[PDB]
Structure formats: C-alpha cells, structure tokens
Design a protein around this ligand. Structure first.
Ligand SMILES: c1n[nH]c(-c2nccs2)n1
Ligand SMILES: c1n[nH]c(-c2nccs2)n1
Ligand SMILES: [Cl-]
Ligand SMILES: [Mg+2]
Ligand SMILES: [Mg+2]
Ligand SMILES: [Mg+2]
Ligand SMILES: [Mg+2]
Lengths: 194, 194
C-alpha cells in the first residue's frame, strides 16, 4: 500500500544528509517524514558491518569480543560490536574481517553473514550486515593481538564471557559513565533468555 | 581523555537536527563529526523498544514483532514494538503503552535495560529495551485490540522464539522486508546460546 513519492534534500553535510520524505499512507493520504541518510553509500548492499566475534580457546569459556570508543554523537564512551563502513567494492565479509583486525587485532574466520538489517528505521535509512566470526584464540596469529587503528581511530578491546555477558555489561555500566549499544544489549538479553 | 568542545547547529527540522560536533581526540588534536539528534528529547532516553514474549500454554513461546512502512527506509521493516517516551512517562509505562497501541497485547514488565544507543557513530539516539511477558491465555489478550494513533499502520507478526532467526530469514527471502538490527541480534544470540 505505502510508498515514497519524493525525497527533497534539506541539508547535506560531508558524511550525513537530512531529507524531507513525502510518502503515500495506506488511507491514500500524502504525508511527510524527516529522514537521515549517509552520503557515503554507493553500491554497497549496506552502509556498514558489525562483527559478532566469538573468541574460542581451549579450556576457556567462549568470549564475545567488544570495543569501547568515544562517540562524538553521544558525547561519551560506548561499548559496541566491532564495526565499520564497507569500502566501495568491498564485500561485507571482507569488511567484517578487516574491521575486526583493525579494531581488535584478531584474525577471524567467517561463520555467517546476515542480510542488510536497519539501524534505526524511524530515523535513518542506515543498514548493516551483522557478520558472525569465530576467532581461534589458540592460533599464534591471535596470541598478542594489537589493534591497527586508522587515522582518528582510538579503540579499546573488552572481551567478555558469553555465558555471563549481560551481567558483565551491567557491571561495566555500574562502574563508569558509558553506554552499551542496543545490538550488544539485545544479544546479551537473548543469551540470558535462552 | 576525549570530550566534546562545542556543537554547531547545521540544520533543525521539526523532528531531527544535524550538528557539527567539535571534540578533542586522544592525541590532543581537535576534530569534527557530523552528528544527528532528535528535537523531541526532554527523559532517560528517546524511546523504548519492547521484547514481548507471548506465553500460551501448549504452544511455543512467541516473540511479538511489528511490520510497518518506514519512510527513511523506503520500505517495510520488521521491528520490536517501539515508540518515543512521552514527557513525564517512565520507560516501563511507555513500553506497556506502546505494546498495547501497536499489538493490542497487555503485558507484564519482566526487566528494563539502562539507556542503550541506537547508532552511536551517527546519532545520540537512545532507548530502553523492555522485556515484557504476555499471558496469552488471559481473557484480555484473547482478541488483542491494536490502538494506532494518527498515522500509525502496524501489522503484528508473532514468531516462535525457538526458531526466530530462521523464521526471520524466511520473511526476508519471501516478503522483501528489512529486519531490524536489534531483532536480528536477539535472534542470533538465541541460536548462539549454550
Ligand atoms: C522522525 N522524522 N520524522 C518523524 C516524524 N514523526 C511524526 C511525523 S514525521 N520522526
Ligand atoms: C558520520 N558523521 N560524521 C562522520 C565522520 N566520519 C569521519 C569523520 S567525521 N561519520
Ligand atoms: Cl523472558
Ligand atoms: Mg569502527
Ligand atoms: Mg574502523
Ligand atoms: Mg512505533
Ligand atoms: Mg506511538
């Protein structure tokens, strides 16, 4: 029933733009919406990837590898899955493995790749692939993992056991001012609920 | 170590604004970011998203989701029930209220996250994730009456919790919908548990 009629640019920054969206509602009436989009999306199947990195080591419990970094939009530190935008011509898998290595030092193995999923669909058109990757932490490559941060990238690695993820996240939030990402919290809540 | 120095308004709509954030990087170098904010926040968070666990004896437990046209996305998305928290509303009350308006179900609160970020590289948007159980055998949830406000047009989709990820992949392959990243993350973790 519903569809886009027009998209009018309101303001276009270097990285983000705002649009006035006109659409047809299902009563047959015309309505508008204020829409955010990135300026960086070309032919990628999504804007970005977020990596679910399951660190596996003999005689260790499985960990989920997370990162902490300052996020200017939030004005503070956030704890997230490793993530980045997909470079033009780059596959989501390759982007995932690359971002994981850049942010954490770890060299992973692909497990699964989601279809493009929406980040905040009432606000923006932004999408990611969620890429599950296993890290063989017994491999020598993954012994002394050092982030290769890019220019203006400053990332801390936090590995938490999968079997206690939600409480460990709660214990981090209780100890400093910091925000957990909604996807990370959602993933931790399901681990509890299962 | 990092912090915000200043925020310049670039453009302000009715619902969304775009800012240029200046911040201090951890080397002591001054940097800028293009940040989105909502104009509606006053609250612990912008919104709530509800994880509604539909419990009916002798049935599988279902997670109740919603399908709506999302003008920023140009298409239909499958999401947790959700909405913005009203001025002077608690996150718990917003959750039960939105769950009722969007699904017709009357639920009980199980737990409530701290404020969690939606897309912290882009926006300051936050939500509380509120887990709610729904006693599907109670008479008030027999014929769930959805109360859509002005301009809401929501379809309800209940899916079994124990197969959620495969059920969502099936809808994406057949119905050309976009699944929400929080929904998908929850689904993934139900599979990855144990
Ligand atoms: C975010 N962008 N536009 C919106 C709207 N809410 C009601 C009408 S337009 N939210
Ligand atoms: C989204 N908003 N601002 C951005 C930037 N990326 C690199 C420098 S500023 N992305
Ligand atoms: Cl539950
Ligand atoms: Mg990143
Ligand atoms: Mg990066
Ligand atoms: Mg809603
Ligand atoms: Mg509403």
């Amino acid at each position: 029933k519903q569809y886009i009629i027009s998209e009018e640019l309101i303001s276009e920054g270097k990285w983000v733009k705002l649009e006035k969206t006109t659409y047809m509602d299902p009563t047959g009436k015309t309505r508008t919406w204020e829409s955010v989009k990135r300026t960086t999306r070309k032919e990628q199947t999504a804007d970005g990837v977020a990596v679910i990195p399951v660190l596996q080591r003999t005689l260790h419990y499985e960990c989920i590898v997370l990162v902490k970094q300052f996020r200017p939009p939030m004005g503070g530190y956030c704890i997230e899955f490793p993530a980045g935008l997909i470079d033009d011509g780059e596959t989501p898998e390759a982007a995932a493995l690359r971002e994981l290595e850049e942010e954490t030092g770890y060299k992973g193995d692909i497990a699964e790749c989601s279809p493009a999923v929406c980040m905040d669909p009432g606000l923006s058109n932004c999408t990611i692939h969620i890429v599950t990757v296993t890290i063989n932490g017994d491999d020598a490559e993954n012994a002394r993992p050092k982030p290769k941060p890019g220019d203006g990238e400053f990332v801390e690695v936090i590995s938490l056991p999968k079997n206690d993820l939600l409480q460990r996240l709660d214990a981090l939030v209780a100890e400093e001012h910091l925000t957990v990402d909604a996807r990370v919290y959602s993933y931790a809540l399901a681990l509890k609920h299962a």
